[PDB]
Design a binder for this molecule. Structure first.
Ligand SMILES: [Zn+2]
Ligand SMILES: [Zn+2]
Ligand SMILES: [Zn+2]
Ligand SMILES: [Zn+2]
Lengths: 92, 92
C-alpha cells in the first residue's frame, strides 16, 4: 500500500545507522561504504582509539577520511520534501 | 504536476553521471564522494593514467579504492520498483 502520506519509515538508503534516524549532509566511510551523520560517524571514531567502525567494526578508518556522499545528501533532501520529514525544535 | 504517471527522470542521487543513467551495485569514489557504475568509474580511471576523476577531475584515485555505497544500491533498488525502471537483460 501507500506510504509517506502520514506515516513512513526512513529507509537504510538515507538513514543513519548510528542514531537510527535520517541525517543531513551525510558522509561516506571508505572502510566499508556506509553513510552516517558527519558528527555521528566522527563520534564513533573519536571514542574508539582502534577506529572501530560502527557498522563493519573496522580498525583502520578515520574521521578525516570521510568523503562527501553527494547522492546521499540529495536523496535525504528529496525524501524530506516528499513525506515532509522534520521535527519540532525548542527554545533550549 | 506529479511525477511517476508515465514519465519520470532518474535523480542524481542514484543516477550515474558517467553514463547519465541509473546503475546497480553502485560504488563510491573516495576522491570526491560521487557514485557511479563499478564498470563506468573503473573505465574512467583505467583510461586516464592521471587517474582523472570523471566528475571532480582528481589525479590520485584508483579503481581499487572504490568503496561500496550500500545506501546508493538500496535507493536504486527501491526507485526501480517505484517507477518500474528496467531493461532487457541477457542470460549470457
Ligand atoms: Zn566501516
Ligand atoms: Zn547519525
Ligand atoms: Zn572524484
Ligand atoms: Zn554508469
Amino acid at each position: 500500500g501507500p506510504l509517506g502520506s502520514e506515516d513512513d519509515p526512513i529507509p537504510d538508503e538515507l538513514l543513519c545507522l548510528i542514531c537510527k534516524d535520517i541525517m543531513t549532509d551525510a558522509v561516506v566511510i571508505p572502510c566499508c561504504g556506509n553513510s552516517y551523520c558527519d558528527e555521528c560517524i566522527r563520534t564513533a571514531l573519536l571514542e574508539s582509539d582502534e577506529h572501530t567502525c560502527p557498522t563493519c567494526h573496522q580498525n583502520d578508518v578515520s574521521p578525516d577520511a570521510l568523503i562527501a556522499n553527494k547522492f546521499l545528501r540529495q536523496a535525504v533532501n528529496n525524501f524530506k520534501n516528499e513525506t515532509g520529514y522534520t521535527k519540532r525544535l525548542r527554545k533550549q
